[PDB]
Structures are given as C-alpha cells and as structure tokens.
C-alpha cells in the first residue's frame, strides 16, 4: 500500500490499480474505484462487443471506407483506403497498433459509443462510460465522467470477454481476442516491462489528456491460472507528460504482492 503511494510521489502522478489472480481470487487494489480517462484501452472492450455480435465467418466481411473516415492516427487503415479492410483486419489494427480509424469503423459497426455503453451495461459493467469516437475520447478534464472507467471495472470487463469464467465469449472468439492482445506492438515499456521473463502478456495501452497513461492486461504464469490487471495513471496539469516506467514499476509491486 505505502509502495504505491511512494511510486505516485516519484512520478508526480496518481495511480489506479486493480489485479485479480483468477486461480486464487487474491486481489491487489490501490484507488481501484477512482475514475480515469480509459483512452485506447476501450479498443479491447470494443472488440469484445464486436465478437459477441459477429460470427467468425462474419468477421471476414470487408468494410469499405474513404480518406473521409481517417482521423489523426491511422497506421494501418491509411494503407487500405483503396480496397477496404475486413472486420478481422480492423480488429487486428485497432488492438495491435492502436489504429484510431479502425476503432471508429468497428464502433460504427456495433452501433456507436451509446451502443457500446449498452452492451457493457448488459455484461454487468455499470462504471465504464463510452461517449466519443477517437481521438476526441482522449480529451477528458478531471472531474468529468465521459469516456472514463476505473481499474476494477476495466479488469472485470476484460476478464468477462477474455476468460472462460465468466465466459462472455465462446472459446474460438476468446482465443482471437487473446491472440491479438498477446501480439500487441505498443506495450513493451508498460505491464510487459514489470512481469518476470517467461510469463506471457496480452495487453492494451492508452494515453490521454492530463498525462493519462494506462495499460490493461491478462498475464499468464509459465504454469497455472492467469492474472487480470489494470494500471491507470494521470497527472494534475492538462499538458503533462507521462512516464511508462511508472506503469512498469507499479506492475512489479503488484507481482510481489501476488507471489
């Protein structure tokens, strides 16, 4: 407990932490019910909802789009304007590269942010508040509830989609979500940097206004049951920068507490 307070002070930041060992139900919590802008971590839950609504076959449906659909960060989507991309390809881009237009196209396919909210409430998430598209969802002022969640809610929702208990997705679809998250390219300095070598990691990162820096993950020991955790952080000033080391260090504290 005092370890997390010490970390907060070292990085001039505020932490929100929740971790659950699914094998023992042992938990690690630090401000687990405090709201933070969820930022791109929402992309994992958006895909979870997409997977509840579409068959594996239906993920092969090609989605056409134009340059008018592109936003501020389109690493993959900008390359396929001419042909379009399948729902499978869009989910890959959104999760592995944090492609913003890919998230927006998926969000439109599932009915928009209000539909994502309804589907999250249906799985029992009464806290996550989807409201906006990318990148405007990153513009959260402290005190606002729009486009925010908590460490506890994000772990609960991530666990619901990714794991067999409480299996909100069938096995084949869970496998897809886990595979994409395991092959994420954006989180090497976050949760991945705080877990021991040999443990497998499936994560989704996010960064937003007020120096918000987040990472949510499912982590596996070489042998045994997974840990689901969320490490969220923010700062007092609008134009504050973040340090990935805060997340990596907070992950190290969590792992000590769990082992």
């Amino acid at each position, epitope marked *: 407990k005092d370890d997390f307070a010490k970390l907060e002070e070292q990085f001039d930041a505020k932490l929100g932490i929740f971790a659950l060992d699914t094998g023992t139900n042992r938990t690690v919590a630090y401000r687990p019910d405090e709201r933070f802008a969820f930022a791109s971590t929402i992309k994992a839950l958006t895909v979870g909802v997409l997977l509840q609504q579409k068959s594996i076959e239906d993920l092969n449906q090609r989605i056409t789009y134009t*340059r008018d*659909d592109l936003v*501020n960060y389109n690493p993959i989507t900008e390359k396929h304007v001419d042909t379009g991309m399948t729902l499978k390809e869009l989910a890959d881009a959104s999760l592995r590269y944090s492609d913003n237009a890919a998230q927006n196209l998926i969000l439109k396919q599932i009915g928009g942010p209000e539909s994502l909210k309804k589907e999250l409430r249906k799985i029992g998430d009464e806290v996550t508040n989807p409201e906006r*598209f*990318e990148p405007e969802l990153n513009e959260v002022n402290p005190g606002e509830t729009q486009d925010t969640s908590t460490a506890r809610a994000l772990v609960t929702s991530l666990r619901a989609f990714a794991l067999e208990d409480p299996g909100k997705l069938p096995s084949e679809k869970r496998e897809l979500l886990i595979d994409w998250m395991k092959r994420n390219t954006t989180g090497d300095a976050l949760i991945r940097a705080g877990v021991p070598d040999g443990w497998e990691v499936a994560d989704k990162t996010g960064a937003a206004s007020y120096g918000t820096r987040n990472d949510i993950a499912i982590i596996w020991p070489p042998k045994g049951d997974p840990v689901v955790l969320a490490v969220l952080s923010s700062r007092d000033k609008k134009d504050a920068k973040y340090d990935d080391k805060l997340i990596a260090e907070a992950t190290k504290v969590v792992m000590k507490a769990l082992n």
Partner: nanobody, 122 residues
C-alpha cells in the same frame, strides 16, 4: 441552403485573420460546426469543431493554442480567429456542419453540410 466562408486571403507570417462562415437556407444553431483545410498537394486535414449546447471546442494539435472557434447564433455565422499564422497554415479553409454526432469530429464523412472554401495565404 448554403455555407459561405469569408475573411480569408493575403496575410503576413505572424499576423491574424478572422474566418467567417455565413449560413443560409436553414438555421445552423443546433448543428455541430467545424473547420477543415486543404493545401495544394497535401491531404485534407481537420482544423476545429464546436458542439451546439455547451459549445465544447476541439482543435488539431497543429493548430492548438493559436486558433479560436466561436459562434453567433443570431447572425447564423460561426467564426475562426487565427493568431500567430505560420507558412504551414497556407491552405483552402472549408466550413463544415452536421445536425448530430454521427462519427468523429476529425473525420470528414461526419459532416453532411460543406462549404465552397476560402483561400488563406501566409
């Protein structure tokens, strides 16, 4: 119905321009307004966006701190005050509108009402 943009043209680096977007045919007071720009050769990019109620403003990083989006519901006009103009700001400025939030403010496909555009030179 039409959206006509004025206040653009010949200006020096570091100077200021106030772009005016005059509406006609219908009231645009309940509409989510915005600005987009297109430079010769360079791709069309988002500039600014404003909501109808609370009037929340959204600006591109490339324009943030220098530009200011403001409304005038009575005159059926929206304004874009551009300060500390850079050679980078040289483009054709388009006034955009949508009655509802159908997508991202940064996405051109989100706007159902488009203007003819006004030339801005630095």
């Amino acid at each position: 119905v039409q959206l006509q943009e004025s206040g653009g043209g010949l200006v020096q680096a570091g100077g200021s321009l106030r772009l005016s977007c005059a509406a006609s045919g219908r009231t645009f007071s309940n509409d989510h307004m915005g600005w987009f720009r297109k430079a010769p050769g360079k791709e069309r990019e988002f500039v600014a966006a404003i909501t109808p109620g609370t009037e929340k403003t959204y600006y591109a990083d490339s324009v943030k701190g220098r530009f200011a989006f403001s409304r005038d519901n009575a005159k059926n006009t929206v304004y874009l005050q551009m300060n500390s103009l850079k050679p980078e700001d040289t483009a054709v400025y388009y006034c955009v509108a949508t009655p509802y939030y159908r997508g991202s403010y940064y996405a051109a496909s989100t706007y159902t009402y488009w203007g003819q555009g006004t030339q801005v030179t630095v």
